[PDB]
Design a protein around this ligand. Sequence first.
Ligand SMILES: CC(=O)N[C@H]1[C@@H](O[C@H]2[C@@H](O)[C@@H](CO)O[C@H](O)[C@@H]2O[C@@H]2O[C@@H](C)[C@@H](O)[C@@H](O)[C@@H]2O)O[C@H](CO)[C@H](O)[C@@H]1O
Length: 160
Amino acid sequence: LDGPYQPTSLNLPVDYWMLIAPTREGKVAEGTNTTDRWFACVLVEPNVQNTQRQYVLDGQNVQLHVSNDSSTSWKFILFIKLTPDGTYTQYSTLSTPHKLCAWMKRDNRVYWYQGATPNASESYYLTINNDNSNVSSDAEFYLIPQSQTAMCTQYINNGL
Ligand SMILES: CC(=O)N[C@H]1[C@@H](O[C@H]2[C@@H](O)[C@@H](CO)O[C@H](O)[C@@H]2O[C@@H]2O[C@@H](C)[C@@H](O)[C@@H](O)[C@@H]2O)O[C@H](CO)[C@H](O)[C@@H]1O
């Protein structure tokens, strides 16, 4: 567990989980290959009835629909658009009272933990084909090597 790192932008090295620790509901982080994937994760607090919320994604205000029917778990939602003028679309969610999410660049992909703790797992990915894909995090984060995926899984499901 290398960190915390302060919010920043980076060419996230391949084969590291970026375990992100946001402070509260809102945008958490964005990333892109600049070609055909612009992705973002947002965090929704417990007890949110279906609604639109405004996020600044790719520099622009976007109204996205969110909900969280848990009274204890936060919900991370992973949104992806495929072109600059496209639509950010929900692909995956992670429900967790421990407030942590993680993604990793590996195998020409970005892997992402999804499901509901305490058996969330790294079962979603998108294809990026760009090992220099850039990530900008508004939150503190940690780096965990892929060799220690089992530990990242432990932290996702139980906190630090
Ligand atoms: C958004 C993105 O980059 N998608 C890739 C991705 O899509 C896969 C992947 O998300 C896995 C994760 O478990 O789930 C599916 O296999 C998904 O496949 C895509 O979506 C489904 C609904 C089908 O329409 C399928 O034909 C489609 O490929 O990886 C694939 C390669 O496996 C592509 O690279 C997508 O663009």
